[model samples]
Target: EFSRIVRDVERLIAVEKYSLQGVVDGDKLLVVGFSEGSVNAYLYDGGETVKLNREPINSVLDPHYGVGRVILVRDVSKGAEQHALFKVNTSRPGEEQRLEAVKPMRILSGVDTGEAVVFTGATEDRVALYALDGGGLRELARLPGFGFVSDIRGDLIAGLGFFGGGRVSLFTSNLSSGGLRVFDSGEGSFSSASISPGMKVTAGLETAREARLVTVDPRDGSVEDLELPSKDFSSYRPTAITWLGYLPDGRLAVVARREGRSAVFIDGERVEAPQGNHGRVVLWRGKLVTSHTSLSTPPRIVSLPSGEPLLEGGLPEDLRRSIAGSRLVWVESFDGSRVPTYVLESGRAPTPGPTVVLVHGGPFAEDSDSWDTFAASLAAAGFHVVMPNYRGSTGYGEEWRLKIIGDPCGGELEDVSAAARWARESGLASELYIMGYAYGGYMTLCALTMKPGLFKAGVAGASVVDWEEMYELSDAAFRNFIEQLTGGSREIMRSRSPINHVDRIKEPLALIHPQNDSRTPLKPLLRLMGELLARGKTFEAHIIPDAGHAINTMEDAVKILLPAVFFLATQRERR
Candidate 1:
C-alpha cells in the first residue's frame, strides 16, 4: 500500500448502518476517493490493510447514482441526468455486480444524498427528498435556491446535510426577513419572518432541535456564551473530528464530538449532538461507536453498544481480528469578516523552528483539513506549518471564494500577515519560511516582495512571475481565472501582481517550476528570475527537469523538499 502520511484519530461507526466498510476475501476494506480511483477497494487483515482491486476503479459506485447499498456516491463529472445508484457485489475479482436503474435525473449534487434520501439543495433554492429501496430511487420534494445547505443527519437530518455560508433560513418561509442565521427549520422554505441566526436556540423547543443549520457562524447566530451539551459527560481530554460515520441498525450517524474539539454545524446552527459519552455518540438509529483521543492516543472503541471488541464482531476469521479505526483533523478556513484560517499544529516542533506557512493556490482555493499530505509531511520535518485559507478559499461557499476579483494580491496577504504575526508574536519561530503552489505560489511571490521583512525566505513552486507574462502564455482556462481575479484587464493584472513588487524583495528567494506545467508554464518563473537578475537580487532559484508544481513522490520529497526546506532551515539556523 502506498501509504501517505497517516495522522492520529478515531472512528465513528454508526450502530445503525451495516458499515460503509466491507470485507473482501476476509479483509476489512475502507473507501477513499481519488480522481483516478474509479475502482477503489482495500482489504483489511485484522489490523493492517491491502488493496483488493487489481486496477484503478473510476468510481466506487456510479456518479449518476449518488447512493448505493454496497456504496453511496456522486459524480461531479456526470450531469444530473446521469446520476446512478447500485448494489455492489464485492465477492468477485472484477467489477462488483451493480443493481441497475438506481435513480432519475436530479442534477448530480445540487442536493445532498446518503442512505435512504438523496437531497437536492436550493432548487434555485430548494431542498427535495427521495427514498431508496428495492423499488428503485424516487424523488419526493425539493426547495428552490435555498442558499448553502449545512447538514442532514440520517435519523433526523440524516448522517449528512449541507453546511452553507452567510445566512440560515428559519424554516424555508423566512427568506424575506433577510437577516442571516445559522439554524433553520429542516422542513419548509425560508421566509421573511424567519429566525435570525445566533438567536439563542430555545432549549425547550417542542422537538430536540434535531436538525441544525451551520455555516461559519452559529445557526442561531445570536448566542454569545456557548457550551456544548454533548461535552458535559466527557471524562478524558477530548479532541474531536467531524466526519460521516456508519451507525448500527443499518443507518448513518453524523455528529460533533467534543473529544476532538470538532463540532458539526449546518447553515451555521450548532445542533445538539446525539446523547452519549465514552466514545459513543447517539446518532439516528442506535449509536455510532468509537474510541476518542488525541493524535498521540491509541484507538479503542469506547462506544460499542453491543460491547463487542474489534475481535468479536460476527465476521470472517481474517476480518474478525482486524478493523480500520481512524480520525483526522486537518486545516479548515473559518468564515468571518476577518481572515479565515484552518490551523493544525502537530508533529515534532524543532527547537526555535522555521515556520512553514503554506499559502494555497487559486487565491480562491484555500486550505482545509479535507486532505493534504504535503503539509503534514512538512510538519513531520520538524517545521511548524500554517496553511491559511485567506480571502478567496473555496468550500467556505461561493461568496467568500470570489474575493480575488479586482483585488488579486490585495489584503489576501493580510491573511498571511496575520499568520506571520502569530508566528512571530507567539515566539513560535525566529524565522518564517513561506511557500505556495500555483496561485498560492503567486501569493507567496507577492507576499515576499511586498513586505520583504516578514519572512526568512520563500519558495514559489511553478511560480508565476509577472501577470503580463501569465496573461500572454496562459491557456483559456488560466486566462479566465486570471481575468476573474484581476477584473479582466491587463492593467489590473499588472498592478495586482507580486512581480510588480519585485524591487521590494530583500530576502532569500527561490522559484521552483516545471518545464511542462500547462497551468503555469516555465516562462513566468524564468521572467521573475530575470527581473531579479536585473535588480541584482541575490537568491537561490531551482528548476525541476520534469517535475511540475510541487513534488509528489517521497523520492521527489527527498530530492526537492529536503533541499528546499533544509535551505530555508539553514537560513533560520544562521539568523
Candidate 2:
C-alpha cells in the first residue's frame, strides 16, 4: 500500500523567502520574498523544490501590477520612515533588485491582514500603494469614520474590497472619492474580510446584520441563496481572523469561514464559498488542497502552481514508501451511524494484534485525514491506529454533526466507547489502548471514568481533567467559543466538568502536557495532581517546557507519547 503521500523529504523544495504567496506567472513563480537581504524575488524554475516560511517574513504580494516582480517596502536604519517598497523581477529569484520609494508617506499597520500592502496597479498608485507600486497610491480611499483595520483583502481591478472598521464598501478606479457603506456593529469594530482573486466586485447589504456576498459584478451582489439553511451565512461573525491567497485562475481569494462558520452559502445558482477556514477542497490540474488542516498533510511539499498536493520528497523515501499505506476509515457509531476516522494498520494486523484507537482534540472540529506526527510515530511503533470522528465534530454537514452539541462531554464518550467495542469486534483492534489529545485527552479520561473495568489502560496528553477551572484560565476568545458551544454558564459548568470523575479513573493513566499552555493551563493539572496526592490516586505525568497547548515538537511528543505505548504494549494492565 502506498502512503497517499507523493514525495519524500529529500525531494523537498525550498522557496526560502518566508514565501507563502505562490502564483504561476507563465512557467515562473511569483513568491513574496523574505530574509536573503532581498524584499521580493521571483522563481523561474524549480517549482518542485520550493520551501515556505518557518518564521515571520513581513512580506506582501498583489497581482494588480500585472503578474510581475514582488514590490516590497524595505526597512531603512533611522530614516524618515521605517521601510520602503522594493520590487524584484518575477523571473529572477534574487538577481537584480530595484528599490522603489516615493514620498515615504505614513503606512500604518491595521487589523486587516489579507490585503496587507494592496497595490493600486503600476499606472495608479496611492499613499498605501506607493510602497508597493509608486503610481497606485492615489487610488486608495480611506473610510472617514474608522481608525485601525486588518485582514484587508480586496482587488480594485474588479472593484471589490472588505476589511475591518465597521464598514463594507465597493470601490472603482474611475471615481476616486471612495463610495462606502458601513455596518457599525460594535462587534464589526474588529471584523475582517478577504476577497477571492478573480472576484473583484462585491455585493453585500451593509444595513442587514452579518450581510455580505462576493460575486463577479457589483450589479449581481444580491446575497446568494444557500443549499444548507440552518447553519447559513447569516451566523458568520467576522473576527480578527483574515484568510488571504490567490485562487487557481489568478483570482484574489479571501474567505470569512471562522467569523462566519454558521453562515456559509454553498452553491445556490452560483453561491460558493468553502466551509470553514479552508476556502474549499480546491483542485487544480487534478490535485487536492483543502482549506482545512487536511491540506497541510503528509507535510513534505507545499502547493504546486495549481494548488494540488505535491510531496516534494519531504519525508525519507523508505519511510514515505512504507507509510504511504496509511489510510483513513470510518467506524460505526453507537447509534448505528458511521463515524469519520483515519486508520493506519501495520503489517496486515499481524494475525490479530493489539491496536490503538485515537480521538482528536477539537470537540467541535472534525479530525480529518491530516497527519499527526506523534500518532504516526506510534503507528511506526507497530500499533494500528484508529481515529474516530464522533458526534459534534465539524466538516461534515451541520445537522448530521449536532448530535453531541447538547452534551459534548456526554455523547462523545459513549460514541468513543461504542467505537472501542466495534473495533475489538471487527478485529481491527484485538486489545484496545484508547488515547486522546486536548479534548481527546479529556475524552480519554472520561472513557475510563465513564466505563471503569473496561479497557486495559489509557493515555491522555494535554488532557483536560476539569473543564470549568480551565475555562477560567482560557483566553476570552476561546472561553466565549467554548461557552457558546458548551451551552452552559460558569457555575453549572463545574457539575458538568470532566474533573469531577477523577476518582472514578481507577485505571493506570499516563498524563502528558505542555507547560506553557494558556488554553488548558497547567494549573488545573497541578491541582489534579494535588488532589490525587490527598486521595492517594497514583499516576505518572510528563511535562515539556515551552510547549504550547498541543505537543507540537516531534521530540517532546515522542518523549511523552512512547512511554505508555511501549509500556502498555509490553507490560500487562496494572491497576
Candidate 3:
C-alpha cells in the first residue's frame, strides 16, 4: 500500500509543470516555466510557446515592456544563489550572451531598460544596488539593508527597502548619476512602488490593520494619500498589498489580498480575475493579463476581467480529485489570536484520518490559497495537510507580522501548535504529523524539542538548526535579515535554536538539507545530528549534493521532496 502511495506521490510531484512571473512582451507574454525537467524562460505568443534559454535558469530579470531581449538569472554556484545574468534575444531563442561585466552575486531584484540592467546584489561585504550600462558597471547606492529595484522611468529609479524593525522605506535614485534618496513612511511600510508618467512615486502603503495607496514626491520626500476615480479599492479593505504598478496604458494596477485570496484592481475599480492570488498586472494587446494561482490550479497567465486562460499547465484529473477540497479556517492560538489556516482535505483519506501540519518557509511568507506542490503531494499520499499562517506571516496586518520579530520560536510556535490541536479537536485529524522547510523546518525542530509528543514524526528540510552558527555563515543579506529577526540579541539566538535543546526531543525527526545552502548552512545540522545521537534520540538525515536552498530543477526538487514523503509514509506505517 505504501509503495502504491509512493507512486501516487511521484505523479503528484512530477505532474503539471507550472509557469510564473509573466510579463507582457509586445504581443506575447514572457514567463518562466518548469517544463522539460527544469525551469527556463519562455515566450508565450498567442497559442504557441517558445523556450528562450538553452539551459535551465533560476529566474528572469523583469524586462522593460516590449524589450527586444530578456535577461536570464542562472545559478553558477549550485544552490548558493550566486546568480549570473545572461541576455537572450526575444526573436532568437536559445541564443544567450553572458553579461561578464557583472560578476556572480546574490541577485536580490532587478529591472532591464534595454540600455541598462539595474539590480541589487549581495556579496560578502555589502548589499548594493548596481547598474550596468554602456559605461560598464556602476554601484549606484549602498543600501542600509535588503533592497529591491521596483521600477525605473527615465533617470528616476524607485524601490523598497527593509531597513529594520519590520519597517520598509521607499527609496529613489538616479540611473545616470549615483544619488540615493530615502523616503520614510510614518504610516507603515511601503509594500510596492511605481513611478507614474507624471514622475510621482505611487506606492501601496501597508499599515497596522489595513492597506491604502499613496503618492510620494520624489523631489521633496513628501507624501500624499491617493484616491482613485472609483472607491472600489478602498471599499475592498485589503489587509496586504501584493503588488502595484502603472500599466503602459496609463492605468494603475494593484493586486491586494484580504483573507488569503487576492483581487485585481485597475485604476481603483476591481477587475474580475481568477479566484486566488495574482501577480503583477500587465497590459497585453489592449487587454489586461496577469499570472494566477490557487490551491487546485498551478500558476498560469490569464486574461483579466474575463478570467480566461492564455497559457496554463495541465493538472491530472486523479491528482485533482485526490486534493478533494480546501478551506480557510481560523484556529485560536494560546493568546486567543485567530490564526489563518489553510486546510487541504484528501479524498484518498477518511474524514478523521492521518494529517500533516505543513508549515511554510520564509516565516515571512503566508500559506494562502496558492498552489503548493508539497501540500498537494501530502494529500495525494492520503494525508490531509494543514497550513497555518502564524503571526509572522504576510498578507495579514503589520501588527500581527511584527509580533514574531524578537520572539522567533515563541508566538509562532504556539500558532503552529494551535493549528495541530484544532485539527484534532475539530475532528479533521485522528493522528498528526509535522513537516516544513527552511523556517518551517526550524519550526519542526522547535516542535519536536519544545513540544515533544505533539507530533507522531517530523520532517525538517533545509531547516535552521543553530541560529548563532547559521548567522556566522550567512552572507550580508541573510545576516541583516537574521539580525532583524533576532533583534540583535545573543540570548534570543541561543535560546531559540533547536540545536541547544536536542535533549528534549522525544519524537522521530527526519532531517533534509541542501549541502550548499548558504542561508541555512549544513554545518550546524551535522552538529545537531551528533547532539541527537548523544542524546539517544530518533533521527535520520539526508543531505542533497550540489544543491542549495533554491530549487530550479525537477531533479533537485525530487531529491529534496522524495525523501520527505518516504519518511512521512514510513512513520505512518510504523504507527
Candidate 4:
C-alpha cells in the first residue's frame, strides 16, 4: 500500500508537462516548457508549438519584444548553477549558437536586445553587470550587492539593487558610455523599474503599508509620485508589486498583489486575471497573456479577461483529485501576531489525519496561492500540507518582513510553531510532521530543537545547519545576503545554528542535501551527522551527487523529492 502511495507521489512529480514565462516575439509566443522529462524553450503560434532549443535549458533570458533570436541559459557545472548562455534564432528551431565570451557564472537576470545582451552575474569576488555587443563582453558596472536588470531603452538602463541592509535602490547606467547612477528613496524600496518613453525611469515603490508607482529622473535623481489617467490602480492599493513594464503599445502593464492573490492592471485600469499570483504581463497577438498559478493549479500561460489557457501543464485526474481543497487562514502566534498560513487538505487522507507542516525556504519568500510541487506531492501521498508565511515573508507590509532580520530562529520559529499548533487545535491535523528545504529546512531543524515534540519527524533538504560555516563557504552575493540576514553578528550566527542544539532534538530527522550546494555546503551537514551520532540522536542523511541547491532537471527533482516522501510515509506507517 505504501509503495502504491509512493508511485502516486512519483507520478505527480513526473507529470512531464508545464509551461512558464512566455515572451512576445513578433506574432509568436516564445515560452520555456517542460516536456519529455526535460525543460526546453518553445515557440507557440497559431495553435502549433515548436521546440526552439536542442537540449534542456535552465531558463531563457527575456528577449526584447519582436526580437529575432532567443537566449537560453543552461547550467554547465551539473547543478552548481554556473549557467552559460546559448542563442537560438527564432527562424531556426533547434540550431543554437554558444556565446563563449561570457564565461559560466551565476546568471542572475538578463535581457536580450537583438543587438546586444545585458545581464548581471555573480562570481567568487563580486556581482557585476555586463553587456555583450559586437562579440565583446563589457563590464557595465560593479554593483555594490545583488542586482537585476529591469529595462533598457536607447542608452539608458534601469535596474534594482540590494546595496545593503534589506532596502532596494533604483540604479541607472549608460549602455554606450559606461557610468552608474543610483537613486535612493527615503520613503521605501523600489521593487520594479522600467525606462519610459519620456526618458524617465518609472518604478514601483513599496513602502511600509502600501505600494505605488513613481517616476525617477535618471540624470538628476529627482523622484515624484506618478499618477496614471485612471484611478483604478490607486483605488486598488496593492501591498506589493509583482512586476511592471511598459508594453510595446505604450500601455503600462503592472501585476500587483494583496493578501495572497494578484491582479493585472493595464494603464491604471484593472484587467481580469486568473486567481492566485501572476508573472509579467505581455500583449500577445493583440490579447493580454500572462502566467497564472494557484494552490491547486500548476503554473500555466493564460489569456486575460477570459482566463483561457494558452499553454498549460497536464495534471492527471487522480493526482488532481488528491488535492481536496486549499484555503488561507491566519494563526495567532506567541507574540499575538497573525501568521498567514495556506493549508492544503488531502482528499486521500481523513480530516484530522497525518499532516506535514511544509515550511517554505527563502525566509524572504512567501507561501502564496502559488503552484508548489512539494505541497502537491505531499497531498497526493495522503498528507495534508501546512505552509506558514511567518515573519520576513514578502507580499506583506515591509514592517512584518523586516522583523526577521538579525533574529534567526526567534520570532519566525514561533510563527511556524503557532501554525502547527493551529493545525492540531483546529481539528485539521491528528499527527504533525515538519518538512522544508533551504531556509525552510533550517526551520525544520530549528523546530526540532527549539520546540521539540511539536512534530513526529522532520525532513531538512539543503538545510542551513551552521550559519557560520555557510557564511565562510558562500560567494559574494550569498555572503552579502547572509550578512544581511544575520546582521553581521558572530554571536547570533553561533546561537541560531541548529547544529549547536543537536542534543536537544528528540524527533527523527532526515537530512537531504546536495553535495555541490554552494550556498549551504555539505561539510557542516557531515559535522552535524557526527554530532548526532555522538549524541545518540535518531537521524538519517542523503547526500545527492553532482547536484546543487537549484533543481532544473526532473531527475534531480525526483532524487531530492522521492527520498523525502518515502521517509515521511515510512514514519507515518510506523506511527
Candidate 5:
C-alpha cells in the first residue's frame, strides 16, 4: 500500500493555489489563483470546480450592494505585470463559462495593478479602486497614493501613506484632487486594516513584539487599542491579524497565525476547527466557513465549531491513508534557545534509518503544518523527516524574526546546524540528507559547505548562490530587504554567501531550479555550477522549463520531487 503512494499523491493534485476570496451570491464560495491554471468556484449548493481562466488572478471581491455582482483582477495578458478587471455575474444560473469564452467586461486599460494588491468596485456607479502597476493605490482613474488601500466605504478609502511613515489616513478624493487626511500616526507597520460595518476603520500593527490591533475613529482620529485573542503559550507573540469580515452581531472576526498554525478569533474569543492549520476564515450566512489542510488532512471547506464538510472534496481514501502523522518537537540550539521542529515519521520504519532534514524558504516564514505532499512523500519513502523553524522563522514574534536580518549565517544557520546534531543525538537519523528551496536552498548550500560531513547528500532548489547577483536581479522589494539585511556592505553578503564556501562541501550535491525564476535567478546558480564543474566537484544540476521560484504545479512538483526522492533515498553511507 505504501509503495506507489508518491505516484498516487501526484495524481491527486486537486487544487494548487486555491486562496479563498470570500463567498458570493449567497452560498457560492469564490476561490482564485490555482498554481497551474484557472479560478475555481466551489459551489456549496452543489459541489463543482468551475474552470474560470488559464491566467492567474489577484483577487475576487463582492461589494454586497449588488447581491451577486463581483469584480476580479484577471490577467488578460501573459505575465503578472499586465492585468485587467473581469466581472463575474454570479447571479447567472448553471455552469460557469470558461473565462476566456466570455470577454472581460472591463479591460482596466493603462492600469497594471500587478497582482491587484487591492481591488474593489462599487454598485453606486462603475467606480473601482485598485493599485497601479504595484505603485501606490489608485481609485476612480488616478494614482491616489492611498498607498496600500485596505478598506473602502461609501465614498472614503482608508489606507496608509506612501511617504507618511506608517500613518493611517482616510480620503474621499476623485481623480485629480489629493484630499487625503491622516487620522492615526505611529504604532508600527500596518499589517491589516479594514473598514467596519459602522464605517469605523481599524488596523493591526506589527510592533517589535506582538501585533497591536487598534481602532481609529475616522472623524476625530482618536485611536484605541483592542484586545486580540492569542493563546500560544509557547511564544509571547502573534503575527498581524487579518480582518475576517464582521459578525452579524457587529462583532469583528479576525485570523492570526500562532505557533505555525492559523487561529480564528471572533471578538477576542478563540475558536477551534479540526486539528489543522485553518485559513480563509469568513462569515457566510451566519456561519463561520474556513478552508483547512494539513500534512495528513485534505484541503476542504468546513463549518467551524462542528467540523462538517461544507462541500465534497472527494480525495481518494488511499491518499489520505498514506499520510503519516507528524509531531512538534523543540530542540535546544547552541545559544540554549528552543528551536521548534516538525518530525514526520513512517512509524512502520525500522528504529534507525536515514533521515531527511527538509528546510523551508522565507528564512522569514515559518513552516506551518500545511498539506505538503512532497514532504509526506519523503516520509512515505521511509525517511524520518525533521523541519526546523529556526531563529528567523516567523510566528515566534518579531524579535525572533529579526535574528536572521544581518547575521543569517551566525544565527539561522547555527540554529539549523544544531538541528542536524539534535537529529543524530536523538538516534532518529542515520545517513542524514538535507534539502531546501529558495532561502531554504540557500541554507542547503550553506549547511553542506559551512558544516561539511553533517549530511550525506544535498538538494538545492532555486538557491541563491551569489547574493550580489540576487540583489541585482530580484525585484526592488527584495533588493531593499537585501540592502537592509546586509547593512550596506557587499563584503558582508559575499562572506555569508554559500557560493563562496562551495569548496568545503564534502557530499554529493544536486541542484534543481526553475529556468524562469526571477527571485533566485539562474545566473547565480549557473555561476556556482560552473565553479563546481571547473574545480571537479561532484554535483548534478537540473533546470525545469516554464516554472518559477517554487515548483508551480503538482506535475512540475512531481518532476522535481521524483528526482529528489531518488537522489536522497539512494545515497551511499556518509564517508
Candidate 6:
C-alpha cells in the first residue's frame, strides 16, 4: 500500500528528470536530459523521437544557427570521459520524421564553457565565453581570476569575478586580445549591469537601497539614476528582485521574490504565470521561453509574456492532483524574527504525519515554491514536509541574505530548529527528520551533531563534513565565497565543521553523494562516513557514479531518494 502511494511519485521524478532541460529546435521543440542517464530528444511536429545514448547529458541548446540544435553529452557508451558539444539537425520526411544528422560541434577533452554561452546576435558569428577552466570574447577574451561571464550585449560582455581575494569586479570585454575593463559600481552588486539591446547605454538596478533603474554609457562610463523601488511596489515580504536577462526585443526580464515566492517581470509589466516557480527565460522565435515548476506542476516550458504552454510531457492527472500544495507558514526565530517557511502535506493523509524538515542548499540560495519530486514523494509516503528559508537565504532582501556572512552557523541553525518546533507545535507531525543536499546537507549534519535529540533521523547529500578541507579543495571562486561568508577565518571554519562534533550526534544518518562532484567533492563526506563507522554511529552511504554536485539525472535521483526514504521510514517506524 505504501509502495502504491509513491509509485506515481517515482514516475513523476523519472519523467521530470528526462525533461529537465530543453530548447526550441527551429519551429519545433527539442527536449533533452534524463536522471535515468538516458539522453533523448522528442520532435514535436512529426511526433517522432530519438535516443542518443544511455548516459546523462549536461545541456541542450538550439543556438538558432547552423543546421538544427546543439547538445552537450558524453560518449560514455564508448568508455569516454570527455564531453563534446554536438550540432543536431532534424527534418520531416513526409509522414515520417528524421534527424538529419548529429555531428560534433566542439570536442572538450578537458575544457568547458564557463558561464552562459551567449550569442553576439542572430548571426553565424558568435562568441563563446568560458569559465577560467572553460576558455572567450571577440578574439578569445580572458576573464579575471576565477570569474565567469554574466551577460552579453552586442560586442560587449558582462563579467563578474569570484574567489579572487575579497575584491569583486564587474568587467566588460576590451574588444581585442583577451582583455577586460572593470566597470564602475554606482550602487552595489545587485545593481543593474546589463547592456540594452541598442548598445547605447548599460542599465543597473541602482539607488542606495532603492531599486532605481540606473543607466551607464559604456563609452563615457557615466551613471544615470532611474528611480524605482527595488521591491517594485508595496509589499510586506522582503524582496531582492534583480534583472534576470535581456530579450532581443529591447525588453528586460526580472525575477522578483516577494515574500520568498518568485514572480517574473518583462519591461514594465509583470507577466502572469501559472501557480508555480518560473525562471530561465530565453527568447525563442521572437517570444520568450521559460522553465516553470511547483509542488504539483511538473517542470514545463512556457512561452512568456502570454504564459502559453509550449512543451509539457508525461504528467498524469492523478500524479498532479495527488501531490501536496505548499502553504506559507511563519514561526518565531530565536531573535523573534518572523521566519518564513513552507509546509507541504500529502493530500492522501490529511492528518498529522512524520515530519521531515527539507533543508535547501545555498545557505545563500532561498527555498522557493518549486516542484520537488523527492519532497513530494516523502510527503506521499506519509510524511509532512517543512522547508525553512532560514536567515541568509536570498529573495528576502540583502539584510536577510547577509546574516550568515560573518557568522556561518549562529542564526541559520536556530531557524531550522525553530521549524521543527513550529511543525510539531502546529500539530502537523509528531517526529522530526532532517534532510538536505549540498549546503542544506551541511546543515543536516550540523543539526544532527550540534543539536542532538531534536531530530530522530537525517539524510545528507554532498555535505561538507570538514569546512576547512572544503575551502582548501573547492573551486577558487567558491573558496573565496566561503572566506567572505565566514569572514576569512580558518578558526571559525573548523569550529563550525560537523565532523568535529560527530560524537554528539543522536540520530541515524543516510549519506548520498556523487562520485564526481567537484564542488562538494566526495573526500570529505567519505572521511566522515569512515569516522561514523569507526565510532559505531548509525549511518548509510550511497555513492552515485558519474553524478556531480547536483543530481542531474533521474537514475541518480532514484539512487539518492530511494535510500534516503528507506532510512527515514525505518527510523520513523522504530520510533
* lDDT of candidates 1 onward, in order: 0.44, 0.47, 0.89, 0.88, 0.62, 0.61
Q: Candidate 4 has which clashing residue pairs, if any?
A: none
Candidate 3 lDDT by residue in tens digits, 145-247? 8999999999999999988987889999999997799998776789999999989999989889799999999999888889899899999999999999988
**TM-scores, all models, native as reference:** 0.51, 0.59, 0.98, 0.97, 0.80, 0.81
Those runs of model 6 whose alpha carbons end farther than 4 Å from true positions after fitting are 17-55, 60-146, 163-169, 183-187, 191-193, 200-212, 219-221, 227-238, 282-288, 304-308
Candidate 1 runs further than 4 Å off: 1-30, 33-261, 264-353, 362-382, 387-389, 394-404, 464-480, 514-516, 533-535, 541-553, 556-560
- lDDT by residue for model 6 over 59-145, one digit each (tens)? 443332212534444433221222344433354311221122322222221111222233211101222333221232233443333
- Model 4 TM: 0.97
Higher-TM-score candidate of 2 and 5: 5
Q: Which candidate gets the maximum TM-score versus the true structure?
A: 3
Q: How do the residues 3-61 of candidate 1 rate in per-residue lDDT, one tens digit apiece?
A: 22111100111010112232222223333222121324443334643443443332332
Candidate 2, position 95, lDDT: 42
Most accurate candidate by lDDT = 3
Which pairs, if any, clash in model 6?
A: 35-553, 35-554, 35-555, 36-554, 36-555, 114-131, 137-141, 192-204, 192-205, 211-230
Off by over 4 Å in 5: 1-6, 12-18, 33-44, 54-88, 91-149, 155-190, 198-200, 205-212, 216-223, 227-244, 247-249, 312-315, 321-324, 550-552, 572-575
Compose the digit string of candidate 4's lDDT tens values, residues 1-575.
76786677667666645555545457788887666667888888867688888878888888888888899998888778888999888887799999999999999999888898999999999999999999599998998889999998989889999887788899988888777998888877888998889999999988888999999998788989999987889999899998999988899999898888999889899898878889888888788988888876778888888999887777778788999998889999998989989999999999989999999998878999998989998998899999999999988877888889899999999999999999999999989999999999999999999999899999999999999988888778888988888899999999999999988999999999999887788999999999999999999889899888887667778889989999998999896
Q: lDDT tens digits, residues 1-575, model 5?
A: 33464565465554443555566566566665344333333334445565443344445543432146445554343222223555455655332333232223222222111233344322112323443322444544332222345555545556553223222244323223334455544544555666777776767666556675677776777777765444331143466454445544566677776566677777667677777677656667667877777777657677887878765346566555544567788889998888889887765355466788899887656767787666767766667788999887766665676667677667888878878888889888766888888888888898988998888889998787888888776543355456656565878888988888878877889999877675688888889988899878999888887666533346566666777777775573233
Model 1: weakest 10-residue lDDT segment is 8-17
Ranking 1 against 2 by lDDT, winner? 2
By TM-score, the candidates rank as 3, 4, 6, 5, 2, 1
Per-residue lDDT of 339 in model 4: 91
Against the hidden true structure, what lDDT does model 4 obtain? 0.88
The TM-score of predicted model 3 comes to: 0.98
Better candidate by lDDT, 2 or 3: 3
